[PDB]
Structure formats: C-alpha cells, structure tokens
From a paper:
Whereas AVR-Pik and other members of the six-gene AVR-Pik family show specific patterns of presence/absence polymorphisms between grass-specific lineages of M. oryzae, APikL2 stands out by being ubiquitously present in all blast fungus lineages from 13 different host species. In each case, the APikL2 variants and HMAs form 1:1 complexes, with both displaying the same global fold and interaction interfaces as previously described for the interaction of AVR-Pik with the Pik-1 integrated HMA domains.
We crystallized complexes of APikL2F with sHMA94 and APikL2A with sHMA25 following co-expression in E. coli for comparative structural analysis. X-ray diffraction data were collected at the Diamond Light Source (Oxford, UK) to 2.3 Å and 1.8 Å resolution, for APikL2F/sHMA94 and APikL2A/sHMA25, respectively. The APikL2A/sHMA25 structure was solved by molecular replacement using PHASER and the PikpHMA/AVR-PikD structure. The APikL2F/sHMA94 and APikL2A/sHMA25 complexes display the three binding interfaces previously reported for AVR-Pik/HMA complexes. They share similar interface areas of ~964 Å and ~1011 Å (calculated by QtPISA) contributed by 57 and 56 residues, respectively. The APikL2F/sHMA94 and APikL2A/sHMA25 complexes are very similar to each other (they superimpose with root-mean-square-deviation (RMSD) of 0.582 Å across the aligned Cα backbones). The largest differences between the complexes are within interface 3, where APikL2 forms several interactions with sHMA25 that cannot be formed with sHMA94 due to differences in the sequences of the HMAs in this region. The interface 2 region of sHMA94 and sHMA25, which forms contacts with the Asp-66/Asn-66 residues of APikL2, is highly conserved in both complexes. However, we observed that the presence of Asn-66 in APikL2F results in an altered local hydrogen bonding network around Gln-44 in sHMA94, when compared to Asp-66 in the APikL2A/sHMA25 complex. In this orientation, the NE2 atom of Gln-44 interacts with the OG1 atom and backbone carbonyl of Thr-38.
Residue numbers in the entry:
A (entry chain B): 23 to 113
B (entry chain A): 1 to 78
The structure:
C-alpha cells in the first residue's frame, strides 16, 4: 500500500481541500479526485473518471495515469512526485 | 461520438486574465464547455470534439505569454 506510506508523511486525502474544477454540461461528472505531491508537498489537484486513464504533464514528463474502479491511481511518474486518488465525496 | 477534456496551463493570476482565457476558449470551434481548474487557477479545461487545440494554445500563448496542454482525458460515455 502507498496510501499507508503517504499517511507516514501526514497526507490524508479524506481531509485534503477539494480541487478547483467544473462539472461540464452534457458529459458525466468525474467521480475521482487526484492530488499531486512533489517531495510530499501538494502541487496540484483535479478530477478524473474511475475505471479509465488520462495523460498528464508532471514537470518535463508526459505520463499515463490509470484510474481503477475505486479511484486508485497507477503509472510511471517521475522521481520526487506522488499522485493519489480517492472517490469524489458522494460518488 | 468521442469528446476530449483538455487542460491548458497558462499565466493567469487574477479573475480578469482568467475571464479573457475563458472567453477566447469559448469562441473556438468544437469547444462545448470551458472551466477554471488547478490549485492556483492557472488552468482551463475545454471539452469537445473537433477542437483546433494547436490554434487555441497559439491564441492563448499570444494573449498570456505562456500556455501549454498539461492534461488530456477522453470523456467516458454514460
């Protein structure tokens, strides 16, 4: 587990401030929040769709992030960075 | 049919420059919707099909000095 490890450095996703985002008209709302940390410090946050994937630029690096049915995130991300997912509250 | 959610990061540090970016993005062909995102509100997400993103990034890069694509997610239907 890597939530277990985050929790050692004081990261709790259940008590992070929600990302800034919009629910766009005409498409399903995103049901996952992602939080992005460098050397364990929050740099950014956003939303994504469960049981899916997205591409994101982290520093110099384009990365593919896989999002499983429970908003767990996986992918090869650059050294020093950590990305963590959780169900959007009420999803 | 397929639609993309595309996040562009740009130099927007106030409501005025954020507003200008949203208006410019809203006028681009294929843009169905646009919203501010990011911990520093330095990102806009556009949603649509047939968006000329190269052109949209070019127009924003001219207006704001720095703009680049930083996230692409396909819309997951239903």
């Amino acid at each position: 587990n890597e939530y277990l490890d985050a929790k050692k450095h004081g990261i709790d996703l259940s008590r992070e401030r929600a990302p800034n985002f919009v629910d766009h008209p005409g498409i399903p709302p995103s049901d996952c929040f992602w939080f992005l940390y460098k050397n364990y410090v929050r740099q950014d946050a956003g939303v994504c769709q469960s049981d899916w994937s997205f591409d994101m630029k982290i520093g110099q690096y384009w990365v593919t992030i896989h999002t499983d049915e429970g908003c767990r995130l996986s992918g090869i991300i650059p050294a020093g960075w950590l990305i963590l997912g959780i169900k959007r509250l009420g999803f | 049919g397929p639609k993309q959610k595309i996040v562009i990061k740009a130099t927007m540090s106030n409501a005025k420059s954020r507003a200008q970016a949203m208006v410019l993005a809203s006028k681009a062909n294929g843009v169905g919707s646009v919203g501010i995102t990011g911990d520093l509100k330095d990102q806009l997400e556009v949603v649509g099909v047939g968006i000329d993103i190269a052109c949209l990034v070019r127009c924003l890069r001219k207006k704001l000095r720095y703009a680049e694509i930083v996230k692409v997610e396909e819309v997951k239907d239903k």
